[PDB]
């Protein structure tokens, strides 16, 4: 990991590593890489909290392969939970 990090163009390779079956959506893949790696949360003096993870909204027409990007992130990420609004046989978004 340290050997592959010292490459100058490492980040772009990660951008090229996001969803190989998906072609041409480089900025979407960049957003995926940023969300997968994420920032750092912080809490200054305990009083004020700053969130430390990137929320990405993929708004697109049908046939832009957003669902395949979601499936790729579900495969790649450590604790990835898939849910949907219209569907039924899935974990809900509401506590109960």
Partner 1 sequence: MQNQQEENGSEISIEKMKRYITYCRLKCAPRLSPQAAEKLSSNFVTIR
Phi and psi of 95, rounded to 5°? -65, 145
DSSP E strands in the chain: the ranges are 42-44, 48-50
Q: How far is the CB of 61 from ligand AGS (least distance, A)?
A: 7
Pick the binder of partner 1 from 21, 45, 89, 94 (CB under 8 A): 45
Among Mg ion, ligand AGS, partner 1, none, the one that 23 touches (CB under a kind-dependent 5 to 8 A) is: ligand AGS
**For residues 27 and 76, what is the distance between their CA atoms, to the nearest angstrom?**
18
Q: Give least dist CB 56 to ligand AGS, A.
A: 14
3-class DSSP state of 8: coil
Q: What whole-number distance in Å separates Cα of residue 87 and Cα of residue 95? A: 17
Residue 20: contacted member of Mg ion, ligand AGS, partner 1, none (CB under 5 to 8 Å, by partner type) = none
Does residue 67 bind Mg ion (CB under 5 A)? yes
């Amino acid at each position: 990991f340290r050997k592959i990090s010292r490459d100058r163009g490492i980040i772009d390779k990660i951008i090229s590593s996001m969803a190989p079956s998906i072609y041409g959506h480089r900025d979407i893949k960049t957003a995926v890489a940023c969300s997968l790696f994420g920032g750092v949360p912080k809490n200054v003096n305990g009083k004020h909290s700053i969130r430390g993870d990137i929320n990405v909204l993929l708004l697109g027409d049908p046939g832009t392969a957003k669902s395949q990007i979601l499936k790729y992130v579900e495969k790649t990420a450590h604790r990835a939970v898939f849910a949907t609004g219209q569907g039924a046989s899935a974990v809900g978004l509401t506590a109960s």
